[PDB]
Symmetry: D2
């Protein structure tokens, strides 16, 4: 029976902290594969103009291509409308009927899981892993999550470098598509 990580996030942009965290969780929980799932998002979020879903999807593919055990799923961006994790996990249970699912996202996101739709079903579909920076549900501290997507966007908007914060290839993709500037 396979152990499948599900790395859910808006990924605007994906950055090296996300990749460190997925790598650590896969090793710690002996996961066979980690499926990255970019969230579906409208044009605006928390006072924020979220990059179009295709761009966030492509950046996540670029960032994960070199890892033999990472893949990327369009399940949330192609569902249409708002993402509810119960729908994410239902879709992946259908696609991988014989795998145990481990849902991985930021601990600050999972703090509100009892307010997520259908929280009762969530805990029947997967185990949950919250990754956090230092300072039912398992918590994993990841120093590299000091890197945040918000800081990456701020720097890119200010024409300041995001090399090494963000994977090679993603940096150039951000710049040539002018995602944040």
């Amino acid at each position: 029976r396979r152990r499948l990580g599900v790395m859910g996030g808006t990924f605007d942009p994906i950055h090296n902290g996300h990749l460190v965290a997925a790598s650590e969780v896969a090793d710690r929980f002996a996961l066979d594969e980690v499926i990255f799932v970019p969230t579906g998002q409208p044009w605006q979020k928390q006072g924020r103009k979220v990059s179009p879903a295709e761009h966030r999807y492509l950046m996540t593919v670029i960032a994960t291509a070199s890892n033999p055990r990472f893949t990327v799923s369009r399940a949330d961006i192609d569902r249409g409308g708002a993402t509810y994790t119960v729908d994410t996990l239902t879709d992946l249970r259908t696609a991988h009927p014989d795998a145990d699912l481990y849902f991985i996202t930021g601990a600050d996101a999972l703090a509100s899981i009892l307010s997520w739709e259908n929280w009762e079903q969530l805990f029947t579909l997967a185990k949950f892993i919250g990754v956090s920076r230092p300072g039912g549900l398992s918590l994993v501290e990841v120093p590299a999550l000091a890197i945040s997507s918000t800081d990456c966007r701020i720097r890119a908007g200010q024409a300041r470098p995001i090399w090494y914060l963000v994977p090679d290839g993603v940096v150039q993709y951000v710049a040539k598509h002018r995602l944040y500037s």
Copy 2:
């Protein structure tokens, strides 16, 4: 007026020869950008092409790091067999003020010119055919008649000794394709078992 290269190919897989050729042509013809366009439904050969979404992602992975390369879904998001007149009509629509230079392998360019309407082709773009060492194709022989002035150029690219067919055969034989094919693309091919 921007000068845009339009790099048309099936890219199954994209390899370093394609990338060298686009880079050399962009420099030689002073192109501001090269737009890679993976074929949606390439012409059938006597040969099971990888799903278009995989070839699209491989092309994105391969071109991401180049500030002057981008990838278009124009052919992938058009039903039916892919024809270059339709590729260029869509790109003209998306870039109405740009001068377009369609770049592909010399043999495919010969096929385009024997089937598709020249009045449309040479109104939309100029054409660049790239070829590998030892492949002897004359401009007289690439078409059955005289071509519009400055409508077609031919460029030999040594790195096009690397071919997608050889990459697929090697991958099927569990032989390495490192350095023939970009890092990232090699791993993408392996983990999705595209040629196994």
Copy 3:
């Protein structure tokens, strides 16, 4: 006058936190280039440092792709314990008309200032101490007395949560260091078994 960063460290291994810090400092202080200087013989700690040639090659591998980073052998090619006055005297000799900015971790900068001669240090360069989140080091406390005007700046770099010690421990535990440490450096560490 060029403005040159001098990134001094043992780099065992170099990691993405070092590279972020150099990049951020170069942008913030308008540096034209950052010269990485791996220590030749770092001060002994209660800790067996990798041979200097390995740390030099890892730093070259990590910095190669940045047009504004280079690597110097100044400390590696000097016998005896590495001291920053000697590092900066050699770099001043190699770049006599440049303004030098010595960049290192805040704790190492505290050690430099407690042992090495200030008249020489602040004649040769200005100093930038970089620190990770939650590491509380005041500029009052980094030295035992008032510092020359504009002689020292402190910059917090979130990515310096990544530490070389954690990378070495993980590698020793057969745990992944992908994404903490540049591609290429990870493979170099593994195939030379540096921390196994």
Copy 4:
């Protein structure tokens, strides 16, 4: 008993053709490792100003770092003076006393092996593999060797791109050290 490839060349610059060729030979001959050995060279060669040995060595390290089965040796550049392959192989026999050596270089170089010093000893120390472009000693045809160091230098000197001909990292190293321009 290990099978060790010895990839000898001036590597000015190392390029993707060299790496393809070493990769193919290692697979075809089941080599456990390929040791790249940059040749010792004076300031001038065949009417050519050869890059300093340290630069050619570093470029070869940068180019091979990511391959778990490639390494780089300073044996020729640190010997001092002209490189004779009998000395290269004697040095590596000393360093790897229990390995069978396979010396790999361009077929046009090996064509003159009977004029190399001590050719009698060469064939007692190693098997020889000549890699060639299409168009005792084994020959391996490598399409990617259409890429040549000479063409890379000409393009770099003309401010024309060498991306994709030469590994990432090597390209930027060439440019920022102004090796050929």
